[PDB]
């Protein structure tokens, strides 16, 4: 979202930096599993590593939220 949850929304977020609710360069995201150091995790990077039971969800690279795997998320 990064709307009301612009700086964090809930403290249980990766970067949770207020610079994301500001026009400060360097911070692109504060929320989502695909957000690392307030930066979008590069496409191809998993936001969820599989382990037999789980399946690998891959980040879109330009999205902080973990995109649903089209091959059964």
Supply the CATH class: Few Secondary Structures
Major beta sheet summary: 2 strands, antiparallel
- Gross morphology: elongated
Q: Pairing-aware structural class of the strands and helices?
A: mainly beta
How many β-strands, per DSSP?
A: 4
Beta content comes to 5-15%
Q: Superfamily at the CATH H level?
A: Disintegrin domain
Report the helical percentage. under 10%
Rg for CA atoms:
13 Å
CATH architecture: Irregular
Strand order of the largest sheet: 1-2
CATH topology, what is it called? Echistatin
- SSE succession: EEEE
In DSSP terms (H or I, runs of 4 or more residues), the helix count works out at 0
Distance between the termini: 20 Å
The total number of structural domains is 1
Q: How would you describe what is shown here?
A:
It is classed as toxin. The entry lists the keywords Protein, Toxin, Disintegrin. The assembly is monomeric. The entry is titled "Solution structure of jarastatin (rJast), a disintegrin from Bothrops jararaca". With 73 residues, the protein is mainly β. It contains no helices and 4 strands. The protein has a two-stranded antiparallel ribbon. Strand 3 and strand 4 form a beta hairpin.
List the keywords:
73 residues, mainly beta, Echistatin, two-stranded antiparallel ribbon, 4 strands, 0% helix, Disintegrin jarastatin
